[PDB]
Scaffold this active site. Structure first.
Site, PDB file in Angstrom:
ATOM      1  N   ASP A   1      11.590  52.605  44.945  1.00  0.00           N
ATOM      2  CA  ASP A   1      11.299  51.460  44.091  1.00  0.00           C
ATOM      3  C   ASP A   1       9.897  51.491  43.471  1.00  0.00           C
ATOM      4  O   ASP A   1       9.409  50.470  42.970  1.00  0.00           O
ATOM      5  CB  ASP A   1      11.503  50.152  44.870  1.00  0.00           C
ATOM      6  CG  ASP A   1      12.935  49.957  45.314  1.00  0.00           C
ATOM      7  OD1 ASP A   1      13.850  50.154  44.484  1.00  0.00           O
ATOM      8  OD2 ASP A   1      13.150  49.609  46.496  1.00  0.00           O
TER       9      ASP A   1
ATOM     10  N   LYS B   1      23.233  46.095  42.118  1.00  0.00           N
ATOM     11  CA  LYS B   1      23.639  44.742  42.507  1.00  0.00           C
ATOM     12  C   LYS B   1      24.624  44.151  41.492  1.00  0.00           C
ATOM     13  O   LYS B   1      24.444  43.016  41.046  1.00  0.00           O
ATOM     14  CB  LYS B   1      22.414  43.814  42.599  1.00  0.00           C
ATOM     15  CG  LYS B   1      21.329  44.231  43.595  1.00  0.00           C
ATOM     16  CD  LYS B   1      21.789  44.085  45.035  1.00  0.00           C
ATOM     17  CE  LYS B   1      20.612  44.215  45.988  1.00  0.00           C
ATOM     18  NZ  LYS B   1      19.782  45.433  45.702  1.00  0.00           N
TER      19      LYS B   1
ATOM     20  N   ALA C   1      26.926  42.253  39.315  1.00  0.00           N
ATOM     21  CA  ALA C   1      27.279  40.867  39.600  1.00  0.00           C
ATOM     22  C   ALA C   1      27.696  40.104  38.354  1.00  0.00           C
ATOM     23  O   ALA C   1      27.339  38.934  38.184  1.00  0.00           O
ATOM     24  CB  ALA C   1      26.099  40.162  40.281  1.00  0.00           C
TER      25      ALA C   1
ATOM     26  N   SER D   1      19.550  40.872  53.195  1.00  0.00           N
ATOM     27  CA  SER D   1      18.591  40.888  54.296  1.00  0.00           C
ATOM     28  C   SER D   1      17.466  39.850  54.276  1.00  0.00           C
ATOM     29  O   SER D   1      16.782  39.648  55.288  1.00  0.00           O
ATOM     30  CB  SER D   1      17.956  42.280  54.354  1.00  0.00           C
ATOM     31  OG  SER D   1      17.175  42.513  53.185  1.00  0.00           O
TER      32      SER D   1
ATOM     33  N   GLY E   1      11.776  48.258  58.529  1.00  0.00           N
ATOM     34  CA  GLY E   1      10.356  48.470  58.314  1.00  0.00           C
ATOM     35  C   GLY E   1       9.689  47.222  57.771  1.00  0.00           C
ATOM     36  O   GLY E   1       9.394  46.283  58.522  1.00  0.00           O
TER      37      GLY E   1
ATOM     38  N   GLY F   1      13.246  44.976  60.193  1.00  0.00           N
ATOM     39  CA  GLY F   1      14.337  45.609  60.902  1.00  0.00           C
ATOM     40  C   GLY F   1      13.879  46.864  61.618  1.00  0.00           C
ATOM     41  O   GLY F   1      12.964  47.557  61.168  1.00  0.00           O
TER      42      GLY F   1
ATOM     43  N   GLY G   1      16.202  52.276  64.984  1.00  0.00           N
ATOM     44  CA  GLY G   1      17.176  52.592  66.013  1.00  0.00           C
ATOM     45  C   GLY G   1      18.207  51.503  66.262  1.00  0.00           C
ATOM     46  O   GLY G   1      19.393  51.795  66.422  1.00  0.00           O
TER      47      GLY G   1
END
Ligand SMILES: O=c1cc(O)n([C@@H]2O[C@H](COP(=O)(O)O)[C@@H](O)[C@H]2O)c(=O)[nH]1
Ligand SMILES: O=c1cc(O)n([C@@H]2O[C@H](COP(=O)(O)O)[C@@H](O)[C@H]2O)c(=O)[nH]1
Ligand SMILES: [Cl-]
Ligand SMILES: [Cl-]
Ligand SMILES: [Cl-]
Ligand SMILES: [Mg+2]
Lengths: 220, 220
Positions: B14, B66, B68, B121, B177, B181, B184
């Site tokens: 990004d 995305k 939409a 998220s 990160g 989140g 692992g």
């Protein structure tokens, strides 16, 4: 204090070829001073198409990018879009208030405008968007959103959206023509109608635009 | 029968300038073979950046757009995106089944994949998306969708999404990160993690990527 849309008619320029998009837009220029440019054209021809439209036509540009990411990415999308010369950008409300606020913050900083898309016009909108739409609109009002998009294909829903946002807010509405919405009925509630295929696929786009305008002449 | 992502790690590229995006991706190329390219980079540098990544790195490209819109526009967006050489596209499920099917149709025609974004998220996802997300996932199953996106930031929600789609479906997950989140923990449920800023804003992106991989080495 809203954008002054000539003839209450916004062209949805979703042709994907630069030559065709420029030709058709030029042909209808005497009728329309506001053009909605979306991803079909931008992903085919580049963000410089906004520059070319500004250069060629005396037209306001609404970037219909239905921004629908996390706040951090939304900020970047808005910055890039305004840098390219868009007057306004369309943002989805369903990802929530922080995502919308990110766009409003960039628009405020950069001196441009956000349109909040509430309910959509297609059949699939009934599955999830419709049930959230009144709340998305109310959220927009709470966030200070002044410009909104709602569906021509559902007059009862468009009417309710107008109620929620108030008479002072600016409301534009797609789904007119190809999707079945009526220009006059839609303008009972919307400040301006968005029209794509009915105009840009017509044998004579200028005649098509002039015909729509004639049908709503007493509403201008 | 699923996408084979090196080190279960997808780079979210990004950065918004070509030189930096190419340099950083080059710096981490030994660790990844799958890059997610979104609108921040595409709107800043053009759709030609996708072919350039393929030329330089040979990596798979997931176009995180995305998607939409209404079905008709969704079709055009997917066509333009795959024309640019994307291997896959990310599509919102919130606008409903017809909008998703439009994307599936183009992907089938052009030999590509659709990833269905269910729950997002960021905090705003809780307002409208979260309450629809299980149903969006079931819709994906009904439509034959095999690739999904869900949130690293809510492992209990990510686990539920995995339950709905089954072990055969492919699931990728952002929010690792920067958004909090854990690599692992996310890979307990997702096939691959998406990582942007923790790598591309690091002083040493290669060491950042290496560090993430070291932390999940027993999961590879
Ligand atoms: O709910 C919505 C929101 C939109 O932006 N649109 C957009 O408005 C335009 C409608 O074009 P048309 O008149 O060809 O149906 C398209 O660009 C579409 O992406 C829509 O149709 N419904
Ligand atoms: O729910 C979602 C879906 C996403 O695609 N993303 C995307 O994944 C990436 C996350 O990047 P980062 O690791 O810098 O937080 C961004 O490109 C973002 O747009 C996300 O963060 N959350
Ligand atoms: Cl964010
Ligand atoms: Cl549907
Ligand atoms: Cl929020
Ligand atoms: Mg570990």
């Amino acid at each position: 204090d809203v954008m002054d849309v000539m003839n209450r008619l916004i062209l949805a320029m979703d042709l994907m070829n630069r030559d065709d998009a420029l030709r058709v837009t030029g042909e209808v220029r005497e009728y329309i001073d506001t053009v909605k440019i979306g991803y079909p054209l931008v992903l085919s021809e580049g963000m410089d198409i906004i520059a070319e439209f500004r250069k060629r036509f005396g037209c306001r540009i609404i970037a219909d990018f239905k921004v629908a990411d996390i706040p951090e990415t939304n900020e970047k999308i808005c910055r890039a879009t305004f840098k390219a010369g868009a007057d306004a950008i369309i943002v989805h409300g369903f990802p929530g208030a922080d995502s919308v606020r990110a766009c409003l913050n960039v628009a405020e900083e950069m001196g441009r405008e956000v349109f909040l898309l509430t309910e959509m016009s297609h059949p699939g909108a009934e599955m999830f968007i419709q049930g959230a739409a009144d709340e998305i609109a109310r959220m927009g009002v709470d966030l200070g959103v002044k410009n909104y998009v709602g569906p021509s294909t559902r007059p009862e829903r468009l009417s309710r959206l107008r109620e929620i946002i108030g008479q002072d807010s600016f409301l534009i509405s797609p789904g007119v023509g190809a999707q079945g919405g009526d220009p006059g009925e839609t303008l009972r509630f919307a400040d301006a109608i968005i029209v794509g295929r009915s105009i840009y696929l017509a044998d004579n786009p200028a005649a098509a635009a002039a015909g729509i305008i004639e049908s709503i002449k007493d509403l201008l």
